[PDB]
Each structure stands twice: as C-alpha cells, then as structure tokens.
Amino acid sequence: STAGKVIKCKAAVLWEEKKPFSIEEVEVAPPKAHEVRIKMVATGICRTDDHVVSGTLVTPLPVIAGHEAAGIVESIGEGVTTVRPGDKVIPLFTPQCGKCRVCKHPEGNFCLKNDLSMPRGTMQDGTSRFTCRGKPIHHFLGTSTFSQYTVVDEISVAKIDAASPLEKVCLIGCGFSTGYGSAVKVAKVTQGSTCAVFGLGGVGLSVIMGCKAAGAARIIGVDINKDKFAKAKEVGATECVNPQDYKKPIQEVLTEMSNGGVDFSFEVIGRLDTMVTALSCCQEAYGVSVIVGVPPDSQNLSMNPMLLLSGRTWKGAIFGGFKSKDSVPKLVADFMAKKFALDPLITHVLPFEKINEGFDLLRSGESIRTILTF
Amino acid sequence: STAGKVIKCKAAVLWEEKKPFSIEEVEVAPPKAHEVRIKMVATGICRTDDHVVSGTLVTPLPVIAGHEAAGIVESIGEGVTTVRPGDKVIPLFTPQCGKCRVCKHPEGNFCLKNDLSMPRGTMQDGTSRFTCRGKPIHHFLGTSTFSQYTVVDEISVAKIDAASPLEKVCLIGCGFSTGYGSAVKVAKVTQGSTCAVFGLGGVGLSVIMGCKAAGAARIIGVDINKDKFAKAKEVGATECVNPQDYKKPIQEVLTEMSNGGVDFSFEVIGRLDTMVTALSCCQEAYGVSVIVGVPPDSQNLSMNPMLLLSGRTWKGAIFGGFKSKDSVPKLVADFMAKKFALDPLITHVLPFEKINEGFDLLRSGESIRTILTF
Numbered sequence: 001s002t003a004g005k006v007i008k009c010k011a012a013v014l015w016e017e018k019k020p021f022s023i024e025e026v027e028v029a030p031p032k033a034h035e036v037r038i039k040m041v042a043t044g045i046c047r048t049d050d051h052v053v054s055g056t057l058v059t060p061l062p063v064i065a066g067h068e069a070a071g072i073v074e075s076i077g078e079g080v081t082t083v084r085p086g087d088k089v090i091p092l093f094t095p096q097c098g099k100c101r102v103c104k105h106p107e108g109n110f111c112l113k114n115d116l117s118m119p120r121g122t123m124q125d126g127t128s129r130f131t132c133r134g135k136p137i138h139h140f141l142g143t144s145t146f147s148q149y150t151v152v153d154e155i156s157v158a159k160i161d162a163a164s165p166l167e168k169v170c171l172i173g174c175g176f177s178t179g180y181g182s183a184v185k186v187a188k189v190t191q192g193s194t195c196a197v198f199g200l201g202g203v204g205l206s207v208i209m210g211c212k213a214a215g216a217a218r219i220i221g222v223d224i225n226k227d228k229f230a231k232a233k234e235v236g237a238t239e240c241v242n243p244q245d246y247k248k249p250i251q252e253v254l255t256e257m258s259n260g261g262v263d264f265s266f267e268v269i270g271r272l273d274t275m276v277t278a279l280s281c282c283q284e285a286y287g288v289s290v291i292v293g294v295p296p297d298s299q300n301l302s303m304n305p306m307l308l309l310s311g312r313t314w315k316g317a318i319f320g321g322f323k324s325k326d327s328v329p330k331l332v333a334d335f336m337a338k339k340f341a342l343d344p345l346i347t348h349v350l351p352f353e354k355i356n357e358g359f360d361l362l363r364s365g366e367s368i369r370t371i372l373t374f
Numbered sequence: 375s376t377a378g379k380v381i382k383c384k385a386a387v388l389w390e391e392k393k394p395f396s397i398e399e400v401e402v403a404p405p406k407a408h409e410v411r412i413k414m415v416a417t418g419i420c421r422t423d424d425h426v427v428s429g430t431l432v433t434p435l436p437v438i439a440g441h442e443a444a445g446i447v448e449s450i451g452e453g454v455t456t457v458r459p460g461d462k463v464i465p466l467f468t469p470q471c472g473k474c475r476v477c478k479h480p481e482g483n484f485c486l487k488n489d490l491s492m493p494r495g496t497m498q499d500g501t502s503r504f505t506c507r508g509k510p511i512h513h514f515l516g517t518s519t520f521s522q523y524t525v526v527d528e529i530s531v532a533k534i535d536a537a538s539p540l541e542k543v544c545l546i547g548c549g550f551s552t553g554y555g556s557a558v559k560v561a562k563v564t565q566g567s568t569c570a571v572f573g574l575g576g577v578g579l580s581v582i583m584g585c586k587a588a589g590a591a592r593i594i595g596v597d598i599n600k601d602k603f604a605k606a607k608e609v610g611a612t613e614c615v616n617p618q619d620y621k622k623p624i625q626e627v628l629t630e631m632s633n634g635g636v637d638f639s640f641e642v643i644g645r646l647d648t649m650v651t652a653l654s655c656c657q658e659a660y661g662v663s664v665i666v667g668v669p670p671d672s673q674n675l676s677m678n679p680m681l682l683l684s685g686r687t688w689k690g691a692i693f694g695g696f697k698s699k700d701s702v703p704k705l706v707a708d709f710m711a712k713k714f715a716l717d718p719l720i721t722h723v724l725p726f727e728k729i730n731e732g733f734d735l736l737r738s739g740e741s742i743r744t745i746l747t748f
C-alpha cells in the first residue's frame with residue numbers, strides 16, 4: 001500500500017514563465033489531517049493554465065499547474081469525512097469550506113479560503129506537498145492537477161458518481177461549469193432574450209450552451225477567429241460576427257443588430273477592451289454584462305460610468321457562481337442523465353506526456369479542449 | 375383667461391455657465407398637441423441643477439433649468455388625456471412614453487424619449503416654448519421648472535393627489551424618489567444587511583431612508599462634511615464616518631468595520647474616486663454597489679476588473695429605477711398615507727426670487743433641500 005508513504009510519480013513542472021512544461025519525477029507527500037491524495041485520471045487544458053505560463057495570471061513559481069480534472073482517491077488524511085479511497089472525485093479550484101460568510105451566503109461562491117485573490121501556491125497550511133530535484137514546488141489553486149498524483153485539502157474536493165466517465169466530467173471542474181453557470185446563474189438569462197458572447201473557446205461555448213438552455217431567442221457569438229464559428233452555431237449560436245470584418249467598433253455593430261443593445265453580454269476572453277465593449281453593447285437601461293475572462297495581472301480598465309448610471313448591471317464571477325462542493329456532484333448527475341453535453345467541447349485527446357503539444361494546440365487556435373489522460 | 379395665449383411670466387434664466395441665474399420676464403407659448411402648460415407652485419434645488427451651472431453636466435444654453443417640482447395644470451393641448459386644467463402635477467425629468475422597448479421592459483425606466491443622454495434642450499418636437507429678450511431659451515430635461523409657467527410633453531407629467539402639499543411632494547420629482555428607489559428597487563437592500571452610503575445630501579439621506587425601510591441592520595454614512603452626520607443618524611444611519619479622519623483609505627476602513635465588506639454600497643456624490651471606493655468596500659463575492667451620483671462630463675474612471683470577477687455587482691440608475699409616470703402618483707399617495715417622511719430633507723424654504731441664495735446655501739454645505747415657492 002502507498003497509504004502514509006511518499007509517492008514518486010511524474011508531473012508537469014513549470015520552472016519558468018514562457019517555457020514548456022517539464023515532465024519529470026516529483027515526490028508527493030502523504031496527506032496530512034483533512035487532506036486527500038488523488039490518483040489523477042484526466043485533466044483538461046484551460047486557458048487559465050496557459051495564463052500561468054504567459055504571466056497573465058501571476059502565481060508563485062516553480063509550480064504544478066492544472067485545475068480542471070477528475071481522479072480517484074488514493075488515500076485520506078486524518079479526519080476526512082466526505083470522500084474515501086476509491087471514490088471518483090473532482091478537485092475544486094474554488095473551495096467550499098462551508099463555514100465562512102461567503103459559503104453561508106445564498107449567492108456567494110468565492111470562499112474566503114481560496115488561493116485565487118492573493119495566491120500563495122500552497123496547501124491551506126502554508127506548505128507544499130511536492131518536491132522536485134530536492135526543491136519544493138508550489139501548488140496552483142489548491143489543486144495542481146498536472147500530476148499523476150496530487151494532494152488537496154478536503155474543502156477542495158467533491159465526491160462524484162461512481163459510474164462517471166472521468167475523461168468527460170473533468171470539464172465540470174472548470175470550463176463547462178463556469179460558462180454554463182455564468183449564463184444560467186450569474187446573468188440569469190431569460191427566455192426570448194438576446195445574448196452576445198465574446199470569445200468562443202471552451203468557456204464561451206459553455207456560455208452559449210447555458211443561454212440556449214435558458215431559452216434565449218438570439219445568441220450572437222463574437223470571435224476574431226472565424227474557425228470558431230461552426231462549433232458555436234452547433235451548440236446554439238444563431239449568428240456569429242468577427243470584429244475584424246467591420247469598419248465600426250463591434251459595440252456599435254451589436255447595438256445595431258439588437259435594435260438598441262443586447263439583454264445579456266459575456267466577456268469570455270480576458271481583455272480589458274472587450275470587457276468595456278461587452279458592457280457597452282448591452283442595452284443601456286436594463287442590460288446585464290458578465291465578466292468571465294481573466295484580465296492581465298494588475299492592469300486597470302478605463303470606462304465611462306455613464307454606462308452604468310443609465311441602468312446597466314456589470315458583474316463578474318468565478319466558476320459560474322456555483323458553490324463548488326454542493327454543485328459539482330449535481331452537475332455530474334445531470335450530465336449522467338443527459339441534461340447537457342460535454343463532447344462538443346472536446347476536440348483533442350492526448351496522453352499526459354504530450355501536455356506541451358496540447359498547449360501548442362490551444363495557442364495555435366486549433367483546439368477547444370484537449371483532455372489529457374494519465 | 376390665459377389658455378391659448380402666450381403667457382409673460384417670471385423665470386430664472388441661465389444665460390451662461392458659472393454665472394448667477396437671471397430672474398426676468400420670459401414668454402411661454404401655449405401648449406401644442408400632447409403638451410401641458412403648468413403653473414409652478416414649488417421647486418427644489420437639486421445638486422444636478424448646480425452641475426448645469428458648474429459645467430459638470432453639459433446641456434444646451436441658454437436654459438431654464440429645474441427638474442424637481444410640483445404645480446397646477448393651467449391648460450392642455452389637443453389630445454391630452456392624462457391631466458386636466460386644475461390638476462396637481464409633478465413634471466417627470468425621466469419620461470414614460472409607454473411605447474419604447476425600455477418602457478415595455480419590466481425593469482427598465484430610462485425611457486428612450488429622454489433628453490438626458492444626448493440633450494437637445496427642446497420639447498419632443500425639437501422646438502422650444504420659451505423666449506427671453508427675443509431669444510429662444512432651451513428646456514432642461516423636458517421639465518424646466520425654474521419658471522412661474524412651463525410647458526411639458528404629456529409623457530413628462532404625472533397627475534397627483536389633489537390634496538397633496540406641493541411644497542413637500544415636489545421632492546418626489548427627484549431627490550427622494552431617486553435615493554429611496556436606489557435602495558429599495560435598484561439595490562434591493564435586504565433585511566439584516568449592512569449598507570454604506572457615500573454622500574449625505576438630500577439624495578443620500580433618501581437612500582438611508584430606503585435602506586432603513588428595507589430593514590438594513592447597519593447603515594454607515596460617509597461624508598467629508600461632519601455637519602451632515604446628525605441628520606443622517608436621524609433618518610436611520612447607525613454610524614457615520616469622515617474619510618478625512620483616517621490615515622487609511624476609507625474602503626479599507628469600511629471593509630474592516632463590516633468584517634469583510636458591506637452588503638450594499640451607494641455612491642451619492644458624483645466623483646470618480648468615490649465610485650471606485652464604493653465598489654471596493656462591498657463584499658467581494660456577493661456585494662452590490664449602486665452609482666447614483668452624476669459624474670463630470672466626459673471623464674472616465676479607472677478600475678481593476680478583478681473587483682467584479684470575484685462576484686461583485688456594479689450598477690447605476692436614474693430616478694431610483696422608477697418608471698416615472700406609473701410611480702410618481704403612487705409615491706405621492708404613499709406620502710399622504712404616512713409611509714415615508716419628506717420634512718427631514720427640507721432645511722430651507724425661500725421665495726423663488728431667492729433662487730441664487732438657495733444655490734449658495736447648497737454650495738456652502740449648509741442646506742439639504744431648499745424649496746423655492748412661487
């Protein structure tokens with residue numbers, strides 16, 4: 001048995017920004033009290049993992065990234081009550097401690113134990129479970145799923161259906177849930193409404209899925225890469241527009257197309273300019289715009305607050321507004337019952353060892369989600 | 375009789391920015407089709423009228439300003455069905471045409487016939503009813519209440535209770551309804567919540583009234599003028615703070631006081647910096663911040679969109695989100711039924727002839743609302 005013992009395994013270590021991941025041996029300590037060690041089965045490549053590489057999202061290096069994943073519990077530390085060895089699980093990059101003021105609030109999900117706002121790159125106790133070449137290696141969002149084995153805090157893992165297909169449901173750990181919840185829970189898209197979705201990657205496609213599920217009449221996809229349009233239409237876009245095709249700014253185009261502004265817009269890219277454009281294109285008196293994309297570190301946008309004074313609502317969210325531990329098992333159950341589809345998001349599959357090729361696919365524009373198998 | 379005839383009467387004409395009003399004779403044309411000519415009884419001095427004088431708010435000059443008022447219908451044009459000669463009325467600076475997409479929307483109030491966004495300073499037909507010294511004089515927001523007589527479009531007037539005291543209920547034309555609605559309708563303040571209100575003038579006091587009516591447990595008033603604190607407490611503030619008293623930024627102070635951020639914040643001043651501060655002091659995952667103050671013309675704010683990504687909601691509104699013609703008569707009826715008080719807002723009552731002295735009281739910090747009586 002490996003329980004209580006250090007595990008040597010392969011992980012994808014990021015030593016430096018703007019460099020390939022290094023697939024090499026790491027030592028994974030056993031779980032301490034209220035920790036869970038997981039044998040990973042599948043992990044997706046989310047653009048936020050690429051943001052770590054590019055320095056868009058600053059987190060301490062060296063690091064084991066990865067946050068969209070599924071696996072099987074190898075062992076549990078003292079006092080763990082919510083999972084057992086052999087359970088299928090999804091790591092939760094947004095924790096749910098259940099005890100803080102946010103966790104107790106009916107509409108909050110950004111648990112105060114998160115490692116997103118001011119990243120330390122550690123476990124909850126301020127230490128790391130990973131060593132590589134004799135050096136400590138940081139965690140990422142308390143999940144670090146780019147490893148054959150990881151250790152997470154109990155508040156950062158959810159037990160899921162034992163019959164779940166892990167190579168699909170890993171997407172419920174980030175991209176699907178984020179986009180779908182941003183539409184259905186955060187924006188609260190209404191039947192018959194007009195939506196505009198900026199960015200047609202895996203998260204933006206999931207936003208479209210949610211807008212269609214909510215009964216939107218028109219769903220306008222916006223992307224500078226027209227190769228993204230066919231899949232966007234397959235999952236519910238009624239029209240797609242490329243800003244590069246127009247002489248006028250796309251907020252003006254979208255306002256014209258919607259006969260005075262859209263009901264709901266979504267920024268699903270991570271650019272300051274498209275955050276302001278997306279706000280502007282929603283109807284000035286009653287429109288709602290949701291920021292989903294992750295902005296470049298420490299940069300401020302500029303905007304005219306008259307856009308809000310007329311009546312617009314601007315908001316953002318992490319993880320689609322879902323309380324993570326409550327929601328993830330229910331989303332898996334709903335997937336099992338065919339309430340939504342994940343296959344449209346999966347364009348490529350690779351072994352974990354080909355992680356760098358998977359990032360190349362994302363960066364070239366060719367993929368939506370690549371799923372890596374351990 | 376005056377019906378069908380030009381009326382020569384007294385008005386306060388603003389010939390250029392940053393000068394006193396000129397109190398002099400104007401000619402007021404009779405109402406055309408779908409227009410209403412009103413003998414003014416009382417008008418309040420709102421800070422937004424001062425913004426016209428100061429150039430904070432750009433609108434065509436020369437102008438008869440004034441937008442918070444009540445009077446009695448003198449005559450109606452062909453086709454008017456909603457008011458009759460002798461009726462008490464409140465002019466509506468935000469119209470309610472009942473036909474546009476905003477008027478038809480359950481949550482919109484910023485009717486597309488408004489003259490706020492891109493002010494022309496005219497009647498709906500693009501002409502003016504006012505002349506002074508042989509020159510045409512612009513309207514303001516389709517209201518122009520700083521005159522013994524005005525002409526408004528039918529969509530810009532509401533009939534109110536014949537027994538109403540016009541020297542009080544004029545405040546339902548702007549400041550009371552704006553603040554109260556910003557709390558109860560736009561923010562939707564909840565029972566037991568903690569609110570922060572930036573700016574303790576007539577509008578901010580009305581926000582406090584609404585937060586208390588909604589059952590807030592804590593209402594923190596924020597103003598740099600500590601003379602405003604006593605009245606703020608009288609109408610429901612539980613604490614007041616002056617940013618000038620602190621070594622740290624007030625958003626940090628308010629976050630500390632509220633054990634991690636407030637539920638609802640309101641900017642009721644009109645400064646870019648306090649808009650960002652007010653957003654920041656609301657709880658990062660579930661807080662809501664409402665912009666009420668009118669910012670200086672054509673100036674953008676700068677902010678970090680991570681404030682929204684964590685889960686905050688940022689919105690603004692005109693006139694408390696109330697659909698104006700539906701709401702104003704009901705608010706007057708509610709005042710008549712003792713559901714809220716207006717006297718706490720009224721610090722000074724002056725003849726119309728003292729309009730300049732009233733504006734000086736506002737600018738000096740001394741008054742909340744001066745009511746001018748014709």
Ligand SMILES: NC(=O)c1ccc[n+]([C@@H]2O[C@H](COP(=O)([O-])OP(=O)([O-])OC[C@H]3O[C@@H](n4cnc5c(N)[nH+]cnc54)[C@H](O)[C@@H]3O)[C@@H](O)[C@H]2O)c1
Nearest residue numbers: 047048178199201202203223224225269270293294318319
């Ligand atoms: N809020 C959250 O919880 C959360 C979760 C998951 C992802 N994210 C972020 O969401 C964003 C999208 O992630 P993803 O879907 O994996 O990324 P992605 O697959 O890279 O998709 C982004 C899309 O944006 C398109 N695009 C780039 N620039 C522009 C432009 N100027 N105008 C229009 N389209 C443009 C691009 O072609 C691509 O299809 C990233 O910033 C992620 O970091 C946020």
Ligand SMILES: NC(=O)c1ccc[n+]([C@@H]2O[C@H](COP(=O)([O-])OP(=O)([O-])OC[C@H]3O[C@@H](n4cnc5c(N)[nH+]cnc54)[C@H](O)[C@@H]3O)[C@@H](O)[C@H]2O)c1
Nearest residue numbers: 421422552573575576577597598599643644667668692693
């Ligand atoms: N959205 C709307 O429909 C609407 C309606 C009515 C008024 N307004 C605007 O609302 C604002 C308030 O109007 P009002 O109550 O008549 O004005 P007011 O009576 O001048 O009150 C403003 C208050 O802000 C205080 N103040 C000024 N600077 C600061 C500062 N840096 N920090 C903290 N407090 C400060 C000031 O001392 C005063 O008590 C103005 O900008 C109006 O133009 C908007």
Ligand SMILES: OCc1c(F)c(F)c(F)c(F)c1F
Nearest residue numbers: 046048067116141174294318
């Ligand atoms: O893709 C999800 C995601 C985010 F939305 C973030 F804001 C963030 F900081 C992060 F690390 C992350 F993984």
Ligand SMILES: OCc1c(F)c(F)c(F)c(F)c1F
Nearest residue numbers: 121122126127128136137138
């Ligand atoms: O906070 C403790 C800690 C460190 F000090 C590191 F230098 C490091 F790489 C690490 F992973 C870690 F957890």
Ligand SMILES: OCc1c(F)c(F)c(F)c(F)c1F
Nearest residue numbers: 420422441490515548668692
């Ligand atoms: O005080 C109400 C008020 C506003 F909130 C405005 F935004 C505006 F432009 C205006 F002219 C006005 F009178």
Ligand SMILES: OCc1c(F)c(F)c(F)c(F)c1F
Nearest residue numbers: 435436496501502510511512
């Ligand atoms: O409304 C028409 C109108 C004008 F066309 C002006 F050029 C002007 F100065 C003015 F005050 C006015 F009211």
Ligand SMILES: [Zn+2]
Nearest residue numbers: 097100103111
């Ligand atoms: Zn929590």
Ligand SMILES: [Zn+2]
Nearest residue numbers: 046048174175
């Ligand atoms: Zn992600």
Ligand SMILES: [Zn+2]
Nearest residue numbers: 471474477485
């Ligand atoms: Zn209208």
Ligand SMILES: [Zn+2]
Nearest residue numbers: 420422548549
């Ligand atoms: Zn006003």
